[PDB]
């Protein structure tokens, strides 16, 4: 693959944010990431697909588009009764596997075997009040991340299951790889770029207020399509809903944007954190969920920044003016401390929905 070379970037403490780079040529002042080395990295990357009540036909297209090389991790939070959509998804995955021999793990977010595993290792931020896994995208992602960690993945890439364009999914995974192949830190994040303009406006404002120089470096504030090395992923606290993506940025800037407590994450401060932003060649066509979603998305997004400890009054004032105070985003602790072998054994010993195919 050919891409614009990573030239311009902005540094905030230990955080390097690379300017957005366009994919120049798909199949191969320009960076040349040979097809050969991309495929080589693919085998070390788990593609996590969090889904919830999506049309099977879209799900089918997405799964078929993921490079065979990549282990697929599906976390469903689909409706369980009247009708059991989880069952329909299971039938779909079984058929898909019978025709492709894809390496796949799937599990339902509400499996009581999952709740049991988290309680026993003493990680309870993911549990709701009835002691079951809380409903939500961030929760499903966390579950997916632990499963990816349990199979030894070095990189994890997330892709939404409601994409109308299978080929874009195929490109996303390759672009994540390209991004990882262009970085020099083991702590790397790759975010894809095609309200989000509102979100980016404020994220940049979050840093501007301190530097005194207006910036537009961040253009992936709401990027659902992103990937990270497992080393970075395991140390990040995670929020949920529409706050996940922007919270990753806010948290990284908050914690590593200055040299405070370097002692606690000495290796991260040493290597630094790299954030690549890649503009895909394919446009973005997904399901239209109605606007009580769009409104939600912006409320949660700006709330994440509004509550950041980096937010000055000016910033807070403006966010309010632009939008009662915004609810504080629910944040869950990093999963690093979790003894993975132990967690995994409890999961596979008590989960009634966990399905594995060559993995």
Residues 128-157 contacting ligand GDP, CB under 6 A: 135-137, 140
Angle CA 252–255–258, to nearest 5: 110
Binding segment (CB under 5 A) for Co ion, from list 14-22, 134-142, 164-172, 282-290: 282-290
Smallest separation (angstroms) from ligand GDP to the CB of 289: 5
243 binds ligand GDP (CB under 6 A): no
Which does residue 68 touch among Co ion, ligand GDP, a copy of itself, none (CB within 5 to 8 A, set by kind)? a copy of itself
CA distance 60 to 56: 6
CB of 16 closer than 8 Å to CB of 274: yes
If the CB atoms of residues 286 and 318 are measured against Co ion, the closer one turns out to be 286
Q: Which stretch binds a copy of itself (CB under 8 A): 22-30, 187-195, 269-277, 343-351?
A: 22-30
* CB of 43 closer than 8 Å to CB of 70: yes
List beta partners, residue 188. Answer: 274
Question: Nearest Cα to 190, choosing from 176, 204, 178, 203?
Answer: 176
Residue 52: contacted member of a copy of itself, ligand GDP, Co ion, none (CB under 5 to 8 Å, by partner type):
ligand GDP
With H, G, I as helix, E, B as strand and everything else as coil, classify residue 3: strand
Joined together, the tokens standing for residue 175 give 């672009």
The reply to whether 297 sits near ligand GDP by the rule CB under 6 A is: yes
Is 61 a binding residue for Co ion by CB under 5 A? The answer is no
> Is 119 an interacting residue with respect to Co ion (CB under 5 A)?
no
CA distance 120 to 129: 16
10, 154, 162, 186: residue in contact with Co ion (rule CB under 5 A)? 162
Q: Does 2 bind a copy of itself (CB under 8 A)?
A: yes
Q: Give least dist CB 151 to Co ion, A.
A: 26
Nearer CB in complex with ligand GDP: 76/282: 76
CB of 56 to a copy of itself, least distance (A): 15
d(CA 308, CA 311): 6
Asked whether 347 and 354 are in contact (CB, 8 A), the reply is yes
Rg (CA), the chain: 20
As to burial, measured by CB atoms within 10 angstroms (0-12 exposed, 13-18 middle, 19+ buried), residue 339 is exposed
Which CB, 139 or 171, lies closer to a copy of itself? Answer: 171
Give ∠ CA 355-243-263 in degrees, rounded to 5. 90
Q: How far is the CB of 176 from Co ion (least distance, A)?
A: 18
By CB under 8 A, residue 30 contacts a copy of itself: yes
Show me where the chain is broken: residue before each gap, C-N > 2.5 A.
28, 194, 323
80 binds Co ion, rule: CB under 5 A: no
Q: Return the ∠ at Cα 223 (arms to 222 and 224), rounded to 5°.
A: 105
Token digits of residue 265: 């994450």
Which residue, 109 or 277, is less far from ligand GDP as judged by CB? 109
Please report how close the Cβ of residue 236 comes to Co ion at its closest, in angstroms: 22
Q: Binding residues for Co ion, per CB under 5 A?
A: 162, 286
Q: Binding residues for ligand GDP, per CB under 6 A?
A: 50-52, 54, 75-77, 109, 135-137, 140, 160-162, 224, 286-287, 289, 293, 297
């Amino acid at each position: 693959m050919l891409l614009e070379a990573p030239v311009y970037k902005e540094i905030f403490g230990a955080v390097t944010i690379h300017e957005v780079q366009k994919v120049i040529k798909m199949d191969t002042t320009i960076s040349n990431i040979p097809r050969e080395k991309i495929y080589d990295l693919l085998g070390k990357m788990a593609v996590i697909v969090p889904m919830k009540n999506e049309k099977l036909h879209l799900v089918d297209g997405v799964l078929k588009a993921i490079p065979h090389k990549c282990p697929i991790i599906i976390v469903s939070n689909s409706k369980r009764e009247g009708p059991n959509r989880y069952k329909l998804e299971v039938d779909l995955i079984r058929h898909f596997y019978n025709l492709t021999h894809s390496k796949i793990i799937m599990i339902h977010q509400k499996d009581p075997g999952l709740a049991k595993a988290f309680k026993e290792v003493g990680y309870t931020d993911i549990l709701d009040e009835n002691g079951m896994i809380r409903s939500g995208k961030g929760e499903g992602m966390l579950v997916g991340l632990l499963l990816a960690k349990a199979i030894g993945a070095e990189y994890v890439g997330f892709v939404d299951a409601d994409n109308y364009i299978p080929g874009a999914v195929n490109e996303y995974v390759k672009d994540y790889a390209a991004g990882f192949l262009m970085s020099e830190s083991e702590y790397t994040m790759v975010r894809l770029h095609w309200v989000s303009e509102i979100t980016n406006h404020y994220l940049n404002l979050l840093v501007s207020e301190h530097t005194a120089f207006e910036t537009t470096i961040m253009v992936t504030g709401n990027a659902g399509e992103h990937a990270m090395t497992m080393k970075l992923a395991e140390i990040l606290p995670f929020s949920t809903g529409y706050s996940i993506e922007p919270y990753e940025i806010v948290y990284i800037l908050e914690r590593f944007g200055k040299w405070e407590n370097v002692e606690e994450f000495k290796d991260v401060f040493d290597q630094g954190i790299e954030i690549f932003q890649i503009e895909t060649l394919n446009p973005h066509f997904h399901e239209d969920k109605g606007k009580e979603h769009v409104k939600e998305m912006l409320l949660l997004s700006l709330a994440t920044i509004y509550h950041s400890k980096l937010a000055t009054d000016n910033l807070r004032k403006r966010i309010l003016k632009d939008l009662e105070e915004p609810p504080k985003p629910l944040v869950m602790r990093p999963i690093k401390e979790i003894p993975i072998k132990e967690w995994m054994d409890i999961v596979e010993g008590n989960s009634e929905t966990l399905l594995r195919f060559e993995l």
